[PDB]
Amino acid sequence: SHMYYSYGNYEAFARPKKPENVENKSAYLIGSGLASLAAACFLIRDGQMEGSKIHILEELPKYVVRGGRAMENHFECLWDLFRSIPSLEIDNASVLDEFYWLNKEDPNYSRCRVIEKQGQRLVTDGDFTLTKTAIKEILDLCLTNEEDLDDVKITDVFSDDFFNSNFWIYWKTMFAFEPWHSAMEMRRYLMRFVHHISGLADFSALKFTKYNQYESLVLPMVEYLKSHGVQFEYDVKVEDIKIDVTTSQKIAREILIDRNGNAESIKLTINDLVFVTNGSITESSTYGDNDTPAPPTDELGGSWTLWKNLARQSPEFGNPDKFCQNIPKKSWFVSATSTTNNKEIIDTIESICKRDPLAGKTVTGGIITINDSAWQMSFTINRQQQFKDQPENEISTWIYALYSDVNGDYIKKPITECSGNEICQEWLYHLGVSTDKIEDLAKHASNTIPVYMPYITSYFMTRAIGDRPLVVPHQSQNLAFIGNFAETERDTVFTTEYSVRTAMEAVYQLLNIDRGIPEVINSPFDLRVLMDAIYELNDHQDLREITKDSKMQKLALAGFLKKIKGTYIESLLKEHKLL
Amino acid sequence: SHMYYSYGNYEAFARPKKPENVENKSAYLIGSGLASLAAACFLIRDGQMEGSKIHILEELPKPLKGYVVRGGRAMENHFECLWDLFRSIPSLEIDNASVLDEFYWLNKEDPNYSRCRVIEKQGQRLVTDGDFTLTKTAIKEILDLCLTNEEDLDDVKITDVFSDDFFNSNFWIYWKTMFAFEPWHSAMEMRRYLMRFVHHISGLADFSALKFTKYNQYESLVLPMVEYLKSHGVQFEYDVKVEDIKIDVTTSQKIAREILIDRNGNAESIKLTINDLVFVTNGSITESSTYGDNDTPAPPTDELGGSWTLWKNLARQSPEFGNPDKFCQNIPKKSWFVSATSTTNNKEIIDTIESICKRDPLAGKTVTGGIITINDSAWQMSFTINRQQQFKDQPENEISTWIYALYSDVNGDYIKKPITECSGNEICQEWLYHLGVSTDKIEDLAKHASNTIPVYMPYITSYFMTRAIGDRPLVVPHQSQNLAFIGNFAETERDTVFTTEYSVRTAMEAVYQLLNIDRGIPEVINSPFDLRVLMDAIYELNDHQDLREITKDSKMQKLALAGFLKKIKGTYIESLLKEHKLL
Ligand SMILES: Cc1cc2nc3c(=O)[nH]c(=O)nc-3n(C[C@H](O)[C@H](O)[C@H](O)COP(=O)(O)OP(=O)(O)OC[C@H]3O[C@@H](n4cnc5c(N)ncnc54)[C@H](O)[C@@H]3O)c2cc1C
Ligand SMILES: CCCCCCCC[C@@H](O)CCCCCCCCC(=O)O
Ligand SMILES: CCCCCCCC/C=C\CCCCCCCC(=O)O
Ligand SMILES: [K+]
């Protein structure tokens, strides 16, 4: 139905024929976020649309870290795209090459993932400490149809054993799950990343770009698009799109914009495609400084207002209110980037992560979680420096806190009432810095910039099938929805992969491109991977240990083992350490 | 061990860094087969070896009485190494396009499928054509074979693991003819085939999973590689017969020291260092092939040509170099030996084929979509007509049919002689007979309207001979510093021989190991570990029966299924089973 899914090298390496009649078509891409950028690259590369017919409408005209960071090997659509984007750092190489080599020579992993009691490593760090009841809850969730998970919370499907496991510590902090978030999305994550469970506790599965996501992913694509003549249109806010929703078709007819404070309108025909990135987790963000809190806001911005205006033209365009209203005041809102050249801080980090922060390699290898922090705070030092023109004596630490309405342990205030230096103080406290030194180090030996993001948890809010518009709604002729609030099967939002996937599916479907789209990696269907998951989830126990204290399963196991003794199934189980 | 297996787009699209010290290395590739050429291409593209330091050593120096077809078995999408290679090889047909791009577009424009797979009784379609007619016993035997460890199948034959129900099934007709399996062949390799291609079980009977090049293999695969290699300065050396390679074998090292060659009559010797790599294609299924013509049989032979002599000479220097005798010796005389290429512009023959395969042979698109099997032919004969013409110099009013017989020592039904005693025109008459041509016309249409070239291949079944782990050398034997074995008599995991993929796979593995290239090699496709594929396979193997139909007969299975279903009622597992038609 205008696209199909594939895997393996045949479809990966094959090139689509130029799509029919693309020469008389144009594209309008609302926003210059990564999904729109990705949709424009696919239009250039696989649609062979001329860049002059491709219009990226962005609101803006013309340290803080984190647009994105962690990636994995099985970002199948992202790597398809970025093998074709030249590096801005290596000659005759793609962003993929740069990244692939970088991560070979300095492969990621954490030497200390969770701390407590002011800088001590958690004694069970590395184990999931899941009881058999918790594991059963995990499988039961995977065995639940997604259809049966409308509006279901994480707390509805897990008991306290689960929430007391180390597993949950590692999972909620690395992915930013709150207990009230969508069990649907939690389920997709479990199945989506099962091949990396072996790397969950020590982040051995993660891979990072050289610099921040903008210097390493966005700018390369902007440059790719500029060299192909893509028209970037600034000072343009898209307020509405008039869509004709009939019994047989949906056609976007008109883009209503404010172009430099002036109300204008872009008339569309059936051959003008519109790519809407609906919803935004970064909109309405505010910034503090070392002595000022990022001020809280519940303002809807352009992105949310546009989706709401689209949603009033058809329920098939989604339900933005499920995502941008009723966000619990406890949710993550604040992140901070703390910069310092102070040797005591840097040295304290080294004595925890066991790596020289200033060496230019992995440091924390991903977030260290402060497990007994009131704020449920985690922080990471990536490869330093994360910016191109930053002094090589400086580190930049990124801090976030899952709980926003709880007094700190040292700064007895909610993070939303904290200046940069105060967030720094709470962090240094949990690092174990002598409290007699913390205040001055935060105020005069560091600079910490907080950001308040009202919608940073928005992707994970409990939802129902239908709350997210399909990438190409039923009967849509020239309208697609892209990014992490659009609907596609199996893949997990809050990833850059999801933004590139939806962009590729939108371009391919709307132009009818005759090439397969890589399916979400088939890990949860791979018996090899499933064998490993059991092994790892049970903290490296074989099937005899797993069933030890249970009469019913040790009898079923016995029967099974008599049946499989000396077979290939036995050999597989042994290779995967289950026997 | 100097490699790793991978899958997914990350490693597929990634480029390896230039391997360490490759500027001081050279390569010698014995022969111009596809594996050797494939290796040369990986040397260029991923090794970044200088072309002038790559030396292809080929016997031949650079007279047949008709077009000859072969080498062009089908391909499938999940030839993972092959497409990794040919995405990088320029098409000679389409500008600005790889061989993959050309193949890809062609097979979407003219997808392959068969409209008539098995005939009998002189041109009549098999009534059950389409079905596997597998009994539950037979199905249990297939599954029981896959659940057997490879190690316990040493020297086991296919007749040792299957019984009467299976051998009487359409499945086995389809299977044995399309893959050229003999009942005495390796059950280990049959097992690898079962698992290797389980994702295509739905395409077995109508060939809808097969893909074909535009032209014969040499024009579509080999010649693009040769021009890639020559454009990069690669050295081709003709008139070179390699007789032996001196290998110093020691506790911690195997090193090729010397290549003993006959170069245009003269006994010569290429001296090697550890930095000169040698790639050996050990054994050959086409070695010692002889040709006949429309009036002459291809004369039978037992000669061990150069390839089999070279391997025996290597096997003498270490048991890690394999057992060539398990493959080139004691080949049964009933084995497939003869194929033939029958070329005609005669409208009665062409129209007769059209009436069977339901397509115009001369339109330039799929014709038979792969072999048609004559199920009741004494010879167990099959024949295919690919897209026409398979040769760029051939007239547009001509077709060329490829014909083979699995049984070489059995009288024909019309020409009452074994195929080995038959002239090109006699093979054609036996073929025409089974097409339904009136016997009054068969002699004249085979003798004056057709030109049939037979080929006798002593070793054409040799890939499938019953073997034991260890008979095939590893692609890079343990501790080998500059010696690799490539092609379909070298050992790698899971993959299936008698396929171009296996040749390219070994090539890739050899080059990557010997040069320590830091990029993943695509694993054999993971279909046999894929629950969705295994579900589809149960459905298809039981001729599209959901599980309730499958268990009707066994009141106890009817029960076990009763329980399973309540354990999974309303769950994802149920939904998957319904999606894959088992409920
Ligand atoms: C701090 C942070 C860290 C992250 N880290 C990771 C990570 O480590 N790994 C990972 O996989 N993922 C991560 N993510 C998720 C990832 O960043 C997102 O999935 C992705 O960046 C979203 O891209 P998008 O363009 O689809 O969404 P957006 O970029 O939000 O798309 C909307 C954009 O278009 C513009 N726009 C919106 N509305 C309008 C309008 N009406 N008119 C004009 N312009 C408009 C806005 O400027 C906005 O930026 C992270 C996200 C954040 C916020
Ligand atoms: C496990 C394999 C790949 C996982 C995909 C990663 C993307 C996860 C996503 O939920 C966004 C993360 C949000 C911010 C949390 C802190 C960042 C920690 C981190 O970068 O992992
Ligand atoms: C696990 C048991 C498997 C059950 C039977 C498996 C059947 C495999 C079937 C079909 C393959 C059909 C042909 C696919 C491409 C062949 C390419 C070639 O000729 O080399
Ligand atoms: K899929």
Numbering used by the authors:
A (entry chain C): -1 to 60, 75 to 591
B (entry chain A): -1 to 60, 71 to 591
What does the paper say about this structure?
Flavin adenine dinucleotide (FAD)-dependent bacterial oleate hydratases (OhyAs) catalyze the addition of water to isolated fatty acid carbon–carbon double bonds. Staphylococcus aureus uses OhyA to counteract the host innate immune response by inactivating antimicrobial unsaturated fatty acids. In this study, we deduced the catalytic mechanism of OhyA from multiple structures of S. aureus OhyA in binary and ternary complexes with combinations of ligands along with biochemical analyses of relevant mutants. We conclude that OhyA accelerates acid-catalyzed alkene hydration by positioning the fatty acid double bond to attack the active site hydronium ion, followed by the addition of water to the transient carbocation intermediate.
